[PDB]
Amino acid sequence: EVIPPCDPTADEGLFHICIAAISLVVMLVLAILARRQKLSDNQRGLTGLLSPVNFLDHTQHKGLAVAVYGVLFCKLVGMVLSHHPLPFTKEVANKEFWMILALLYYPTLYYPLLACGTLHNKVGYVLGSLLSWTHFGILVWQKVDCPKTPQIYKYYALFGSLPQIACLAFLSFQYPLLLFKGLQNTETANASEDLSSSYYRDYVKKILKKKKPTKISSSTSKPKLFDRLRDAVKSYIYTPEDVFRFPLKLAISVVVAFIALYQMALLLISGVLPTLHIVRRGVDENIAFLLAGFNIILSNDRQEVVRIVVYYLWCVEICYVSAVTLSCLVNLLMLMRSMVLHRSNLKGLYRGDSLNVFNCHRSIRPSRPALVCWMGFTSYQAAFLCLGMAIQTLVFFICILFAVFLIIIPILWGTNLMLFHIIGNLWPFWLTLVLAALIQHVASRFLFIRKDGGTRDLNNRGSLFLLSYILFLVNVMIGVVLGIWRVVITALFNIVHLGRLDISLLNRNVEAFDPGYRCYSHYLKIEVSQSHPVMKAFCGLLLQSSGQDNKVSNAKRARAHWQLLYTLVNNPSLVGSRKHFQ
């Protein structure tokens, strides 16, 4: 009902031209410095441009990369809603084709932001800060004026840009903050990615020292239903004190999922309630009378029908709000749960142990299609969550109206009693499914099963073969109640765990065809074959001792020959695997 003209939008067509002129310069400046520093693998193996931040480091600071992907995802959200958004200076060429290259446009535009972190010098952060000042400057100035927008909702683009604002603010408090750390000569250090931190050393230290905390304590005891409120804490515990740091590609995928949860929860609320209050206002009771009289019965008092139809459109709005707040809470509970399970999956794949040994009994081998699944694991995580919030809300919406219109209202008020004329006409029938299932459990523990010496339980036969024959046609009617439970409990479990990748929804025997669990294993297999935290700590002792260091070395060898013996005495089974492998 309001339309703002915008001097920012009239300049946004030139801010498309301005910023893309800035981003093209800084990329080619970094092409000059790479021909002035004799860099490692960080150069492009096809042209020579810089790589962005190294993904196969576990000790690298992950504030920049989580920030930039958190911005690049939000521009995808706004791009779907606005139909037009980039016709601006290029040809359309069958306009739906022009809604494609914008997928390749935003990562090109934000590319010099990540590119500064790979150098750690006075050049990078000065160029890095001013760009993060600029994008934070343009967005905030666009939203101070014109908050009300006629696209979707009266406040939508303001609330739609709340992650994208605050995530650029993290770039503004990091590039000057890390430039200020250059006073301590943190720019004379180099891009050695195996820089022996305390993390790599303490992780090997945790393996060998472990024998002294291996001595266990006692066990505690908690009573009923508070341990049940404590075993749920045991699934909450993502915390525990550990020398363990995530991969970079996995750490991005949790936050980018968390932004995607925020965007679907806003799109569902602010797309439905506008078309509900309008009906709640514009009731047209004179017209809804003829809408009633053409199909159904007035049933009394056409004035009171205003009280009637409103008293149901309360409950449609109450249901659809409760459906989103249920579905948003569950996926919030799952990504927290998906955080602790990435920890235990990844330590168990260090050992080659018997946890994920359904495929870890085979060879670690970085094949071709293992690598494509790694290229773009973060996108799969945030894509399966947006479909999660769609289906879960569409299901729970129909699962609460079935409760509200059938058991909640009649216990509250008592208008319609449709189920209690069904269950009230089967009240002797469901007794016999109980009593026969009662007589099978009761007669088993007290007559057939005979606990004996050693608590070993045998059976009093003969009479049992009869009882499993009298109850034959009864147990078919129990077999229908378990039949609908198998269908239900598979439905709930397929939707709750629908937005997770670490878990396969199919059978044990056919896990490899579920495409979600397929791309997660091939991620986690190539992550351990490249950056294992023991061989990356091992080269630290061979590098930082080499750069900082006869019969005298034979005395070192005389210690070395004894330390070979001191290991083999306390480790017997290695002696065969020494002599067969010497």
Partner 1 sequence: ADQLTEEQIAEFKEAFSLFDKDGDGTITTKELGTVMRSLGQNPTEAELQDMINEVDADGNGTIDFPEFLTMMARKMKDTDSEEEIREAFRVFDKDGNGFISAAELRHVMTNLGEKLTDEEVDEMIREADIDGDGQVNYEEFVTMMTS
Summarize as ranges the residues that interact with partner 1 (CB under 8 A): 40-41, 191-194, 201, 204-205, 207-212, 214, 350-353, 364, 452-454, 456, 458, 461, 529-530, 532, 534-539, 541-543, 545-546, 551, 554-555, 557-571, 574-575, 577-582
**CA 380, CA 397: separation in Å to the nearest integer?**
26
Write down the residue that tokens 């900082």 correspond to: 548
For 89, counting Cβ atoms within 10 Å of its Cβ (0-12 exposed, 13-18 middle, 19+ buried), the class is exposed
CB of 455 to partner 1, least distance (A): 9
With CB under 6 A as the contact rule, which of the stretches 22-30, 48-56, 294-302, 389-397 interacts with ligand CLR?
389-397
Measured CA to CA, the distance from residue 57 to residue 579 in angstroms comes to 36
The DSSP call for residue 531 is -
CB of 51 to partner 1, least distance (A): 12
The interface region with a copy of itself, picked from 103-111, 172-180, 308-316, 407-415 by CB under 8 A, is 103-111
User: Of 283, 306, 395, 406, which one interacts with ligand CLR (CB under 6 A)?
Assistant: 395
**What is the closest distance, in whole angstroms, from the C-beta atom of residue 209 to partner 1 in the complex?**
6
Binding a copy of itself (rule: CB under 8 A), the pick from 471, 496, 528, 543 is 471
Residue 398 interacting partner from partner 1, a copy of itself, ligand CLR, none (CB closer than 5 to 8 Å by kind): ligand CLR
Smaller CB separation from partner 1, 500 or 522: 522
Give residues with Cβ within 8 angstroms of 237, minimum separation 6.
340
50 three-state secondary structure: strand
- Please report how close the Cβ of residue 407 comes to ligand CLR at its closest, in angstroms: 17
Nearer to ligand CLR by Cβ, of 232 and 398: the residue is: 398
Distance CA 385, CA 499 (A): 5
Candidates 483, 541, 556, 563; binder of a copy of itself (CB under 8 A) is: 483
CB of residue 46 to a copy of itself, shortest distance in Å:
6
> For residue 410, which of 397, 423, 398 has the smallest C-alpha distance?
423
Cβ proximity to ligand CLR: between 167 and 324 the closer is 324
CB 478 within 8 A of CB 433: yes
- Please answer whether residues 366 and 528 qualify as being in contact, where contact means their C-beta atoms are separated by less than 8 angstroms: no
463 lines the binding site for a copy of itself (CB under 8 A): yes
Q: What part of residues 252-291 is at the interface with ligand CLR (CB under 6 A)? A: none
How far is residue 118 CA from its own chain's centroid?
A: 27
Nearest to 195 by CA among 99, 54, 323: 54
The dihedral region occupied by 54, where left means phi > 0, alpha psi between -120 and 50, and beta the remainder, is beta
180 binds, among a copy of itself, partner 1, ligand CLR, none (CB under 5 to 8 A by kind): none
Between 145 and 353, CB nearer to partner 1: 353
147 HSE (CA, 13 A, CB side): 7
List CB contacts of 408: < 8 A, sequence separation 6 or more: none
Residue with the two structure tokens 């997928």: 103
The DSSP bridge partners found for residue 459 are 449
Instruction: Return the number of the residue (43 or 121) whose C-beta is nearest a copy of itself.
Output: 43
Q: Which position among 217, 220, 509, 550 is part of the footprint of a copy of itself (CB under 8 A)?
A: 509
Q: CB-based burial of residue 178 (10 Å sphere; 0-12 exposed, 13-18 middle, 19+ buried)?
A: buried
Binder among 1, 5, 45, 421 for a copy of itself (CB under 8 A): 45
Among 315, 336, 391, 409, binds ligand CLR (CB under 6 A): 391
| 516 versus 533: smaller Cβ distance to ligand CLR | 516
User: Could you tell me the end-to-end alpha-carbon distance of the chain, in angstroms, rounded to an integer?
Assistant: 83
Binding to ligand CLR by residue 496, rule CB under 6 A? no
Token pair listed for 206: 């945790």
We find the least distance from the C-beta atom of residue 47 to a copy of itself, in angstroms, to be: 9
To a copy of itself, the closest distance from the beta carbon of 334 in angstroms equals: 14
Which among ligand CLR, partner 1, a copy of itself, none contacts residue 441 (Cβ within 5 to 8 A by kind)?
a copy of itself
Task: Report if residue 400 touches ligand CLR, rule: CB under 6 A.
Answer: no
The CA distance from 205 to 125, in Å, is 35
Closest to a copy of itself by CB, 103 or 555: 103
Nearest approach in angstroms of CB 395 to ligand CLR is: 5
* Inter-CA distances, 123 with 13, 68, 566, Å: 30, 20, 53
Residue number, 499 or 540, with CB nearest to ligand CLR:
499
Q: How many CB atoms lie within 10 A of CB 332?
A: 13
Position among 2, 189, 476, 552 found at the interface with a copy of itself (CB under 8 A): 476
Read out DSSP for 240-262?
---S----HHHHHHHHHHHHHHH
Q: Which of 18, 383, 394, 409 binds a copy of itself (CB under 8 A)?
A: 383
How far apart, in whole angstroms, are the C-alpha atoms of residue 263 and residue 409?
33
Contact residue for a copy of itself among 126, 291, 332, 387 (CB under 8 A): 387
Instruction: Count Cβ atoms within 10 A of the Cβ of residue 505 and give its class: 0-12 exposed, 13-18 middle, 19 or more buried.
Output: middle
449 binds a copy of itself per the rule CB under 8 A: yes
- Footprint on residues 140-169 left by ligand CLR (CB under 6 A): none
Which element (helix H / strand E) includes 458? Answer: strand 457-459
| Rounded Cα–Cα distance for residues 275 and 435 (Å) | 52
Closer of 179 and 334 to a copy of itself (Cβ): 334
The footprint of ligand CLR on residues 466-495 (CB under 6 A) is: 487, 490-491, 494-495
- Any contact of residue 300 with a copy of itself (CB under 8 A)? no
The option from ligand CLR, partner 1, a copy of itself, none interacting with 575 (CB < 5 to 8 A, set by class) reads: partner 1
Q: How many residues does the chain have?
A: 582
CB of 152 to a copy of itself, least distance (A): 21
Choosing from 81, 305, 514, 543, the residue that interacts with a copy of itself (CB under 8 A) is: 514
- Residue 291: half-sphere exposure toward Cβ, Cα within 13 Å: 8
Shortest CA distance to 502 belongs to which of 332, 340, 278, 301? 340
Q: How far is the CB of 476 from a copy of itself (least distance, A)?
A: 5
